């Protein structure tokens, strides 16, 4: 009575979409799309807790073997059912170096037995620690105790895929062939114009799904986006030009929303070679960089500064203070000078760094203006260069640039998520960052079971990425986006923003 006759949603994504195979996938222009294909054992509420996906329960003793009991009624979009074997395969997959998962350590993080000796090829991948007890019963052996593992079973890296579809050839993702157990399925495709999903009628909670149509949009321009948001082309943006802010809460109170996300922005220096192999390059850089006139003057969207690498708002996270938090700018740009010279760097032999960054306006303004610091306080010249999403994800893992532009949003509520992608073994680790001591340390607080001592353990890593600065942490995220009114059941509220079309609706308008 109150809902529109046409639930139909056009939603705008950042970027093209580079895969959407759960254990290819690596960014949220690709994942917020899986989330609709596919699921897991479980999904996420608004307010970030777990609820029943394929799984209606899950239980263990000690924290360490787990038991999911799956739906009876779960299926794919080929009307197949979805079984414990489907995870068994799909798990085995992301750990076998065939894959090649950019994902592939997730699986050791979450203690899964074995993972990491499958990863390198040290053990087989049915050595993996994931049983079909029979087709509705999935047990998991953990290493080790880790009371949130269910949460990260919300994570698309666990996500389910369809063996025989998987391996019916390299064009299984494309539309009309990929088969997911998601709320819709993939109808329509064009690269880099949309992305066209209808419903999967299959789908155990079908009933439920309103939206019989979700276009989504990639634009990198925010601009461009905010434009067609405005023309009443966009029902939802991601983001929006931090320079409309105020004139946007003008014209469109209750339609701007930036709450707290938990993910962080930062600049990623090659620890392994160039100028940015030495501590005091790097720790020079890092200080330089002035995160108040950073937060306050280029975003304004409400970020906050980065002073440690976690986001304030991680459950389980009481930091220390940082000694760069407590000194002015004035002091931080005289210290960084003195150990730029201490590297070897003045008008005797001047810095020359290259930056890489992805496409976006923000992107670009944030590197001219932190160019302009170094410039200004240390006398370097940064070369720039933009690539699009889905090239700059592998340029960046090439060992080619100085500096490389990046986020990390949180795969799971609670420290060790950002912490973990500094150690050696995390692929994600732009920086290249190899410290024995920093591994040692969080392999420690996964051994530790209260919230105290672990997070005793994530201040002593946190003090090591301030001391050797091998990333540079700038702001904050806050969930920046443009909802039309007439959009409900967005979950803006979700501190990690997972979303699932099928919580949408359309009111008369
Ligand atoms: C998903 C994984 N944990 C992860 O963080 N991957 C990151 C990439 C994660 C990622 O897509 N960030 C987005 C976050 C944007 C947040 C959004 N509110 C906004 O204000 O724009 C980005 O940078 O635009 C990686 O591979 O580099
Ligand atoms: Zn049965
Ligand atoms: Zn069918
Ligand atoms: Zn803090
Ligand atoms: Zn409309």
């Known amino acids: 009575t109150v809902l529109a006759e046409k639930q139909e949603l056009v939603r705008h994504i950042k970027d093209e979409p ?13 994942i917020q799309v899986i989330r609709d294909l596919f699921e897991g054992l479980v999904n996420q509420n608004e307010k970030g807790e777990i609820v029943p996906g394929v799984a209606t329960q899950w239980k263990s003793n000690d924290n360490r073997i787990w038991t999911f009991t799956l739906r009876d009624n779960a299926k794919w979009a080929d009307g197949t059912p979805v079984t414990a074997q489907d995870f068994v395969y799909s798990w085995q997959r992301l750990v076998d170096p065939k894959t090649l998962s950019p994902f592939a350590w997730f699986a050791a993080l979450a203690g899964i037995n074995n993972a990491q000796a499958i990863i390198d090829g040290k053990a087989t ?23 949130w593992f269910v949460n990260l079973t919300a994570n698309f890296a666990f996500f389910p895929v369809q063996k025989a579809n998987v391996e019916s050839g390299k064009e299984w993702t494309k539309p009309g062939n990929l088969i997911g157990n998601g709320a819709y399925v993939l109808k329509e495709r064009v690269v880099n114009e949309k992305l066209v999903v209808v419903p999967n009628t299959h789908y155990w909670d079908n009933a439920k799904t309103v939206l019989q149509k979700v276009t989504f949009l990639p634009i990198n321009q925010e601009s461009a986006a905010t434009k067609r948001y405005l023309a009443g082309d966009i029902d939802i943006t991601e983001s929006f030009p931090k320079n409309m802010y105020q004139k946007l809460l003008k014209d469109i109170p209750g339609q701007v929303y930036t709450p707290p996300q938990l993910g962080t922005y930062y600049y990623a220096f090659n620890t392994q070679k160039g100028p940015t192999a030495d501590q005091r390059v790097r720790l020079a850089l890092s200080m330089t960089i002035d995160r108040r006139l950073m937060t306050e003057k280029v975003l304004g969207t409400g970020e906050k500064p980065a002073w440690h690498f976690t986001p304030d708002v991680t459950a389980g996270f009481t930091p220390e203070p940082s000694p760069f938090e407590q000194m002015s700018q004035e002091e931080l740009n005289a210290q960084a000078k003195t150990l730029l010279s201490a590297a070897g760097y003045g008008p005797q032999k001047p810095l020359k760094l ?8 923000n992107h670009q303004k944030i590197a001219i203006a932190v160019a302009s610091m170094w410039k200004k306080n240390l006398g370097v010249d940064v070369k720039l260069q933009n690539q699009e ?14 500096v490389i532009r990046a986020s990390w949003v949180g795969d799971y509520n609670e420290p060790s998520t950002f912490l973990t992608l500094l150690t050696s073994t995390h692929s994600g680790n732009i920086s290249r960052f190899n410290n024995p001591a920093y591994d040692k340390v969080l392999a420690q607080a996964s051994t530790e079971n209260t919230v105290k001592a672990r997070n005793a353990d994530y201040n002593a890593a946190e003090k090591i990425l301030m001391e050797q600065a091998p990333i540079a942490p700038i702001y904050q995220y806050t969930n920046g986006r443009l909802i039309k009114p007439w959009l409900k059941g967005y979950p803006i509220n979700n501190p990690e923003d997972v979303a699932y079309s099928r919580t949408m609706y359309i009111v008369k308008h």
Do not use: C, M
């Open 125 to 147: 991948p049915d050595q993996l620690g994931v049983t079909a007890v029979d087709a509705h019963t999935l047990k998991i052996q953990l290493d080790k105790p880790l009371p």
């Open 18 to 30: 580079a895969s959407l195979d759960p254990a290819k996938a690596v960014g949220l222009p690709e």
């Open 389 to 402: 999403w889905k090239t700059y994800i592998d340029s960046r893992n090439t060992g080619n640039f100085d």
């Open 354 to 361: 290259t930056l890489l960054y992805n496409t976006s306006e």
